[PDB]
Symmetry: D2
Subunit: 252 residues, 4 copies
């Protein structure tokens, strides 16, 4: 027996692709800012948005307008460059996730190469922390990178669920799932909080939300994709409900 | 499908009957529920025709793309209508106070012969029969003795529970009642009073074949739209079931 | 501009059929306002068949727009209305002795009662409306009561069995609107209106507000409440603006 | 009484962002028909920026209403349009050398090319619309090409920065319609129209069909696709019918 309760597993909603849609036409709509606040009303525990150097989807006005309006938590994804880090320390989001943008900054799987850029990342982690931001590193589920993330001082890691999501068949999906599971264990063993989310959708998130060690799933595209047919409030509420049901039933 | 959802459409008819027009149309509701993931449509032709009326059942029966579950009382008029229509499934429910226990399930012990004969009459018309009963040892045992292959447990007290403690105690009656029915070779269903925050623990029980759910879906549908309400409930149950199996 | 009043009564109907708190008429009202409703309407019946007293009391201080309280001409219900101080009250017939055969309030027949109820609600700062048939004599009686608003019974128009009958019943409403506006009355409508018969009524310039209930709930079950309300509002505004 | 063409380009825009099959432009198309759309519109661009050949090829046999294919006046795409045999085609500018400063197809300037294209498509049984500005010189030339339909560029109306500018531009669209009907053309519109500016355009009795794209997808994100389509149609019908009576 158990009580269902929303605190069991947090959902971060990524609003980037609402921006993709708005930028397509050039008007202010559909508004990413309204998207974020409506997601909070629908049960999102944080709002996630990636301010790219090249400002391809989310733009600066989106971040600056939304920051003071946020009811829950802002999770600002950004690159490890001095100028973006300055923006992050000025805006003071509750959380930040350091993500690679330039190819020299990522691995072949797609996570931050914390190993190869160790000093720069440890410094970023320090200044963000000095400005009161809880820092996460978006990394591959590779034990060396996880260990390296822990050495940087970052309290959080976000594991890259892309290969899990894009698995070609069930045998390959299970293998990638095991990489994630053992990534979570190694991260927890070092006292890191561990998140996930990349590529997760309405039929592959359950197996991930059933992992007791995961704190928060940060989900973007799939929610927007489901919203077009179903409506934003419902797409959010539904993904949250599925996550919570998987989490709780797997615990007891 | 890891677990089946039957969507009950009675309270769509409640809305319709309040106005006297054909809208909102229960028949549309039922076919759309199937399109959004329902494995069966449940409907209760009461003797007093309070919500669902005969024409709703007759129109729906040849259209249904999954399974029809007809709820009805144990009386000749209704049983004969059921045998004429030949739904895939029927669930015998009480409509008179003399037919129900205080908990509100069918009093199979007190009306054993009438119920056992009903079971025979429907089984002859090719209908899979279920008895709507309390999670009560005596009633479960009696149900097995009627020859009906299915029971649906009355999850009302569980659903209506006020505290964590009271709901825990009622949950274990249901869990116990599932184990008992399975041990006698019955399929066990549930669903009365189940909604979007109490369905998960019941779906987590692997012995439950199908949850037949009504008012919670229609109530949520008002705000969220019917396709979404059904889909979401199905998603939550499957997530609960499969996560608990592994 | 044309106003939509959303009647939440049949949300309460769905709730009372199971005995839980859901669907919550209070939440339905507050979300109708978010979706564009200009007022919320609810009929506290003497027999509390759908909406109940706790519904009206809980919602009243939360209203961001206007509350239109439908109730009968009896002292208890008038006492409750004067205590709640809704923005609007619409006096409706409940007893068979208060009904015309068409179904509106017999204001001619209960003039003194209705006038006193008007004075009583007006003293409590409530803008009073009388639900009536599109009948010139009732419209006149309505005006003599001192009520500033009338709501015309569009149910015959709504339930017309064919186009000829529907057009004649439309002409009656149109004439009623002219008659009521010629006396200084605000005129409302809405009984039985839905998504393919509201347009013609919305197109009449003299209509201030359409108070619509069951059609929005029936649509919302498939479409969602927010959508159903916003859509009715948009259709109404489309019709009105194009008509001018 | 008035038709709604639902343009599905920006559903694909959303799909290509991620590189999976979702959200599926084909599903959107079919669900729009169920919601009341009279036609499905898609622009197969020469660079394939949103809609791709698979979308158009897979959607075509499944279309229950009619397909309106937007494509450019060049052999490759015209040859494709003839393969697909959509019910309607709308010729539109894609290169800087084919469009006016306002953004319409420079029909007067590419007359021989457009006339040939109208011939080729009509001989494949496709009914041809030309996307043009509401300028008399271009409407007259459109008629000269043999094309039975024109679609007026409502973008300047839609982008108007004040009430006065919006009246001026509205008058251009209105007189553009008169001028087109006078030559026996069917006249459409659609570019830039949304849920608070479509009404004045829908009130014009001469307008056959509104082809609307981005406003619906943008609304759909919050309210759901079926609802955004149905609601656009109902506002169009409401405004049209009330304008007639
Ligand atoms: C489908 C719909 O939109 C409903 O509103 C319905 O078709 C009419 O409602 P009535 O029940 O009021 O006739
Ligand atoms: C305001 C709204 O909800 C959108 O539906 C609107 O369509 C915006 O349209 P634009 O794409 O024209 O800004």
């Amino acid at each position: 027996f158990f009580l269902t309760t929303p605190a069991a597993i947090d959902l971060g909603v990524n609003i980037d692709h609402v921006a993709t849609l708005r930028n397509a036409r050039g008007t202010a709509y559909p508004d990413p800012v309204r998207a974020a606040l409506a997601a909070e009303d629908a049960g999102a525990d944080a709002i996630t948005l990636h301010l790219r150097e090249d400002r391809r989807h989310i733009v600066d006005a989106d971040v600056r307008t939304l920051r003071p309006r946020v009811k829950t938590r802002m999770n600002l994804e950004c690159a490890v460059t001095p100028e973006m880090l300055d923006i992050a320390c000025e805006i003071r989001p509750h959380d930040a996730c350091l993500v690679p943008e330039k190819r020299s900054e990522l691995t072949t799987e797609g996570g931050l190469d914390v190993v190869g850029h160790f000093d720069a990342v440890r410094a970023a982690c320090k200044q963000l922390a000095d400005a009161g931001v809880r820092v996460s590193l978006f990394i591959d589920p590779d034990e060396a990178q996880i260990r390296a993330a822990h050495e940087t001082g970052a309290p959080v890691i976000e594991l890259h669920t892309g290969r899990y999501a894009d698995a070609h068949d069930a045998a390959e999906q299970q293998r990638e799932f095991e990489r994630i599971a053992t990534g979570v264990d190694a991260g927890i063993a070092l006292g890191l909080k561990v998140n996930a989310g990349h590529g997760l959708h309405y039929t592959n998130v359950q197996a991930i939300a059933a992992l007791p060690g995961i704190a928060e799933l940060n989900i973007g595209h799939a929610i927007v994709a489901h919203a077009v047919f179903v409506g934003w409030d419902n797409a959010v509420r539904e993904m949250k409900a599925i996550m919570v049901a998987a989490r709780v039933a797997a615990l007891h």
